[PDB]
Design a protein around this ligand. Structure first.
Ligand SMILES: *[C@@H]1O[C@H](CO)[C@@H](O[C@@H]2O[C@H](CO)[C@@H](O)[C@H](O[C@H]3O[C@H](CO)[C@@H](O)[C@H](O)[C@@H]3O)[C@H]2NC(C)=O)[C@H](O)[C@H]1NC(C)=O
Ligand SMILES: *[C@@H]1O[C@H](CO)[C@@H](O[C@@H]2O[C@H](CO)[C@@H](O[C@H]3O[C@H](CO)[C@@H](O)[C@H](O)[C@@H]3O)[C@H](O)[C@H]2NC(C)=O)[C@H](O)[C@H]1NC(C)=O
Ligand SMILES: *[C@@H]1O[C@H](CO)[C@@H](O[C@@H]2O[C@H](CO)[C@@H](O)[C@H](O)[C@H]2NC(C)=O)[C@H](O)[C@H]1NC(C)=O
Ligand SMILES: *[C@@H]1O[C@H](CO)[C@@H](O)[C@H](O)[C@H]1NC(C)=O
Ligand SMILES: *[C@@H]1O[C@H](CO)[C@@H](O)[C@H](O)[C@H]1NC(C)=O
Ligand SMILES: *[C@@H]1O[C@H](CO)[C@@H](O)[C@H](O)[C@H]1NC(C)=O
Ligand SMILES: *[C@@H]1O[C@H](CO)[C@@H](O)[C@H](O)[C@H]1NC(C)=O
Ligand SMILES: *[C@@H]1O[C@H](CO)[C@@H](O)[C@H](O)[C@H]1NC(C)=O
Ligand SMILES: *[C@@H]1O[C@H](CO)[C@@H](O)[C@H](O)[C@H]1NC(C)=O
Ligand SMILES: *[C@@H]1O[C@H](CO)[C@@H](O)[C@H](O)[C@H]1NC(C)=O
Ligand SMILES: *[C@@H]1O[C@H](CO)[C@@H](O)[C@H](O)[C@H]1NC(C)=O
Length: 900
């Protein structure tokens, strides 16, 4: 039926070509109008996460009480030019060694450097920004000293306490070696036991646990350390753009300072939480020139290879501008609606629309070239008749592609969702502006060609032959079998080695050639002993103010054995398996060890009933919990809620402990209502060393396994609350937990669409379709085989290029399958030969441009992500699809093709 519409409308475009060029122009301008309007290129690195994914819902929950996870700037600083030294104690005998970085004159230099960094000036909003402004001080009143994780916080960042020495000039009863050896074993104390005194706390960045500052030490003896780790945590509050940016500026001066810092006594590594999203943007420039010159070669070929100085140069340029017009239109309307225009979309979309649109251009133009007008036939009748001969094919392919991509936007991997929207529309708009504006400006170049005026100013060429000779050899029953054998061999190969495909991005690979983050990843895998931290979160609803409520969560001292912190501790004994690193560091156990009557920590005034200090003189401040036998037991009743806010207001006092303001302040949520209640909580620990792309995934899986294992044991009946873990990266690496099923779903959905449209549209009869769909399945399976053979991973980028791949293979298989299915020659081999000579000779010119671009793409692409993912998968899709469409599909139709 469509033949009437495409014929009559083609005649229309030939008669009156003004209304269609002008109509289409109004369309284009109307969409590009929205282009520059929005053009919001998303870039926060949660674009790899789904807004409904359990990981991002968990993040949106953890942002309720601690808000965001802090930015982290780190330094692995090591001493290369200083040998070890030996500490011999005095009365007791137990010699200890001290590694290179633990020399004292070095620790002085580390202190001068850390003080220099501790105050760096930066300009934001035409103002001035200091570290103290933006780093988190766990006590906004009291001392606003900033958290700073170094071994030097054992010595309170002062050279006096470092050079402390107790003993006469000759012997040394207890120097800094003894203080260090004491703190690394109990870093939550305010009073050393060796000297008269000192404190193992610091400039109050909390109790400096020894694993976050030491590196390269063997096992438990930290003294054998070989590198110092220094961690500055800075606030993040993603919920704001004002101050996050000034933080980014402070880091921007920071990095330049550390890089331009000479100290031959030390070799340094470091990291700002923007360094990745910075050097990555740096690498996203090395290829741009190569991409543009690639498009110059494709454009140039398109201009040249058209027709037999009457070259259709202006026609090729025009069709190009129509394709670019289609891209700008799609990005336009979708921007208008509000679609974050990601970068991968900028790499894929113009390549796609350029390839397919160019193919349509060649089908049409070449179709007219091989046609010769009849006796008294007219231009309207001729170009209209050809437009009918071809149009339902271009509409078939482009339509199945559009519904395929659009239907592809159904998953939640956002990189493929945004893509499938943009492309799913851009293909359609390309077909509109292509069958309307392009053909109507094709009649113009026709009349110019027949009135002898030059194209730019004012038979059958070759590949018709080349395919009239290629088409017979390929399917003389002498050779048919051989071809089927080759393709079944390759397909069997890929079927075999598709399982051993690598899941996940190799973060060390994604960095520029000689960036600094590479040395940072290596120096992490070498020395470091702790990984990212995890916040085992207990949601609202737990009793807490009860025996069985505490024992379900409390740790040790009669607190079950399946309790939460007992679960994380037992899970930490096997660190290199259950990737849970170290001790859990609970609040409720410290609270219990704080209200304790034997402590003089908690005291309330006898007469104002207000909480007395731990350091105050207490004339009348009596103890919170009496020294009865029952009073020494944990606060079971509402007294729990009575004293808990005082603990979370209490501060480090040398007559008491670290108090709750230290770290459990921003950890315990006190819900106010019907008295009081305890909301959500967390138990901060640290993952083991995570380096491999499989490491992170294993850590997330096992951590959530601990979450569920605890949740069943908390005797809970229903989704009233769970115990999920949060970390920096669970958001980024939860997407790999379902990549298998999401890939299968998406490719099966695109295949279901293409098969449906090819079934119903291309008349009927399945076999016409099922042959095509099956051939596409071959294209994808062999594509996976290339991934394995060429070392290509299976992340969101490669997946996007797979969806696109199944997209463009339709441009090969579809026009051939149509040209075959609607034909009446004396043999099936005849129809396959013709369908391979007419359409095939044109599809092969919707190829050699993308191949002649795949050439130059490699020749200077520096980004190894580009060389590995985009170039290699592009090459595999073009050669693989082309061979599977112009070599295999004819032979297959020559035996199973339908008969008419
Ligand atoms: C890692 O740490 C352990 C312990 O801190 C180191 O073992 C110690 O090695 C040195 C010897 O070079 C000494 O500090 C100490 O041994 C002394 O005492 C005995 C007394 O009989 C004598 O036999 C010793 O070898 C030496 O005189 C060791 N201490 C212990 C507890 O074993 C170990 O060498 C360190 N390794 C590295 C690579 O630094
Ligand atoms: C899991 O944790 C450790 C992390 O890899 C792993 O390594 C052990 O600890 C250190 C390296 O961190 C090394 O142990 C060293 O101890 C002796 C002293 O007897 C030293 O002379 C040598 O350095 C020795 O290699 C080892 O590399 C290794 N082994 C031991 C015994 O400590 C642990 O092995 C892992 N443990 C478990 C239970 O999984
Ligand atoms: C953070 O606070 C502690 C105490 O609240 C500071 O320790 C004091 O340091 C200054 C020296 O510059 C003097 O007030 C005293 O020598 C210290 N007092 C005590 C009680 O130790 C610490 O210096 C502060 N942080 C920084 C970076 O100065
Ligand atoms: C550190 O370097 C300075 C100057 O290069 C030098 O004077 C000092 O001795 C070095 N430190 C040590 C422990 O040698
Ligand atoms: C930065 O502040 C530190 C103390 O916080 C001080 O020692 C240092 O001199 C300051 N830097 C400058 C350039 O004034
Ligand atoms: C920043 O603001 C001050 C006062 O508003 C002004 O004097 C100064 O010139 C500004 N900075 C620059 C670089 O102009
Ligand atoms: C540490 O404890 C000892 C023993 O009671 C005491 O003499 C000393 O003053 C304490 N240190 C501080 C800083 O109070
Ligand atoms: C807790 O104790 C029971 C027996 O009392 C034991 O079967 C169980 O395994 C223990 N918990 C763990 C985590 O092993
Ligand atoms: C309570 O203790 C804090 C910290 O130990 C101290 O700064 C404050 O002065 C004390 N309260 C009073 C009223 O002195
Ligand atoms: C507390 O007050 C009571 C009366 O309210 C008095 O009998 C008692 O001696 C006081 N004790 C202290 C330690 O102040
Ligand atoms: C985890 O759950 C299993 C049964 O689902 C239970 O037997 C076990 O005690 C729980 N705790 C562990 C394994 O620590």
């Amino acid at each position: 039926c469509l033949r009437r519409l495409f014929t009559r409308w083609g005649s229309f475009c030939v008669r009156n070509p003004g209304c269609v060029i002008f109509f289409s122009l109004v369309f284009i301008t109307a969409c590009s109008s929205g282009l520059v309007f929005v053009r919001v290129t998303t870039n926060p690195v949660d674009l790899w996460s789904a807004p409904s994914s359990q990981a991002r819902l968990e993040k949106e929950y953890f942002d309720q009480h601690f808000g965001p996870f802090f930015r982290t700037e780190q330094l692995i600083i090591r001493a290369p030019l200083t040998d070890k030294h030996i500490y011999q104690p005095y009365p007791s005998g137990a010699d200890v060694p001290f590694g290179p970085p633990l020399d004292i004159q070095i620790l002085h230099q580390v202190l001068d450097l850390q003080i220099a960094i501790e105050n760096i000036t930066a300009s934001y909003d035409n103002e001035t920004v200091t570290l103290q402004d933006i780093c988190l001080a766990p006590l906004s009143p009291y001392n606003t000293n900033c958290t700073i994780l170094s071994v030097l916080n054992y010595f309170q960042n002062s050279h006096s306490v470092l050079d402390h020495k107790k003993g006469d000039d000759f012997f040394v009863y207890a120097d800094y070696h003894t203080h260090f050896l004491y703190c690394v074993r109990a870093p939550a104390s305010l009073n050393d036991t060796s000297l008269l005194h000192d404190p193992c706390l610091g400039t109050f960045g909390g109790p400096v646990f020894p694993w976050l500052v030491l590196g390269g030490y063997d096992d438990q003896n930290y003294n054998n350390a070989t590198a110092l780790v220094i961690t500055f945590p800075v606030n993040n509050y993603y919920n704001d753009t004002e101050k996050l940016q000034r933080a980014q500026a402070w880091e921007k001066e920071f990095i330049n300072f550390v890089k331009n810092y000479k100290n031959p006594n030390l070799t340094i590594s470091f990291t700002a939480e923007r360094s990745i999203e910075d050097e990555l943007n740096r690498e996203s420039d090395s290829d741009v020139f190569t991409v543009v010159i690639s498009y110059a070669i494709m454009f140039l070929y398109i201009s040249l290879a058209l027709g037999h100085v009457d070259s259709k140069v202006s026609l090729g340029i025009a069709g190009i501008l129509i394709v670019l017009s289609s891209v700008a239109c799609s990005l336009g309307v979708f921007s208008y609606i509000g679609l974050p225009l990601t970068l991968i979309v900028i790499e894929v979309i113009p390549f796609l629309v350029l390839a397919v649109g160019v193919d349509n251009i060649f089908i049409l133009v070449q179709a007219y070239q091989r046609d010769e007008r009849l006796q008294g036939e007219t231009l309207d009748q001729q170009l209209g008749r050809v437009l009918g001969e071809v149009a339902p094919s271009m509409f078939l392919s482009s339509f199945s592609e559009t519904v395929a991509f659009f239907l592809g936007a159904l998953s939640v991997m956002p990189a493929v969702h945004t893509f499938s929207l943009f492309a799913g529309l851009a293909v359609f708009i390309d077909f509109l502006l292509q069958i309307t504006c392009f053909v109507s400006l094709l009649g113009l170049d026709i009349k110019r060609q027949e009135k002898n005026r030059l194209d730019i100013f004012c038979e059958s060429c070759l590949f018709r032959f080349f395919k009239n000779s290629y088409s017979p050899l390929l399917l003389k029953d002498w050779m048919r079998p051989i071809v089927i054998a080759i393709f079944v061999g390759v397909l069997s190969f890929s079927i075999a080695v598709l399982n051993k495909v690598d899941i996940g991005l190799d973060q060390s690979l994604s960095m520029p050639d000689d960036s600094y983050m590479v040395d940072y990843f290596k120096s992490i895998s070498q020395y470091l002993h702790a990984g990212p931290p995890v916040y085992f979160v207990l949601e609202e609803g737990h009793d807490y103010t009860s025996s069985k409520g505490q024992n379900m969560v409390c740790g040790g001292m009669g607190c079950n054995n399946d309790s939460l912190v007992q679960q994380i501790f037992n899970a930490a004994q096997l660190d290199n398996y259950t990737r849970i690193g170290f001790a859990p560091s609970s609040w409720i156990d410290d609270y219990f060890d704080w209200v304790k009557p034997q402590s003089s920590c908690c005291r309330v005034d006898n007469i104002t009933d207000q909480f007395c200090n731990a350091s105050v003189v207490d004339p009348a401040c009596v103890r919170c919990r009496p020294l009865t036998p029952e009073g020494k037991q944990r606060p079971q009743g509402g007294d729990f809620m009575r004293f808990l806010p005082m603990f979370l207001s209490d501060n480090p006092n040398p007559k008491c402990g670290k108090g709750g303001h230290a770290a459990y302040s921003s950890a315990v949520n006190i819900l106010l209502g019907h008295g009081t209640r305890v909301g959500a909580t967390y138990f901060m620990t640290y993952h083991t060393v995570l380096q491999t792309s499989a490491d992170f995934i294993d850590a997330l899986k096992k951590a959530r396994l601990i979450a569920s294992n605890v949740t069943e044991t908390m005797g809970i009946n229903g989704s009233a609350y769970r115990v999920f873990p949060y970390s920096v990266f669970y958001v980024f690496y939860e997407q790999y937990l379902t990549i298998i099923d999401d890939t299968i779903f998406n490719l099966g959905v695109s295949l279901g669409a293409i098969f449906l449209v090819t079934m119903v549209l291309l008349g009927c009869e399945l076999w016409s379709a099922v042959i095509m769909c099956a051939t596409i399945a071959m294209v994808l399976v062999n594509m996976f085989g290339v991934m394995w053979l060429w070392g290509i991973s299976l992340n969101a980028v490669s997946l996007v290029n797979l969806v696109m791949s199944c997209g463009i293979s339709v441009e090969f298989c579809s026009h051939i399958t149509r040209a075959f299915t609607v034909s009446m020659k004396g043999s099936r081999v005849e129809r396959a030969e013709e369908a391979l000579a007419h359409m095939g000779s044109s599809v092969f010119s919707g190829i050699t441009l993308t191949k002649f671009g795949g050439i130059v793409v490699l020749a200077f692409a520096k980004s190894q992500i580009f060389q590995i993912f985009y170039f290699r998968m592009y090459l595999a899709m073009v050669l693989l699809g082309a061979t599977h469409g112009l070599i295999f599909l004819p032979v297959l139709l020559s035996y199973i093709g339908p008969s008419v």
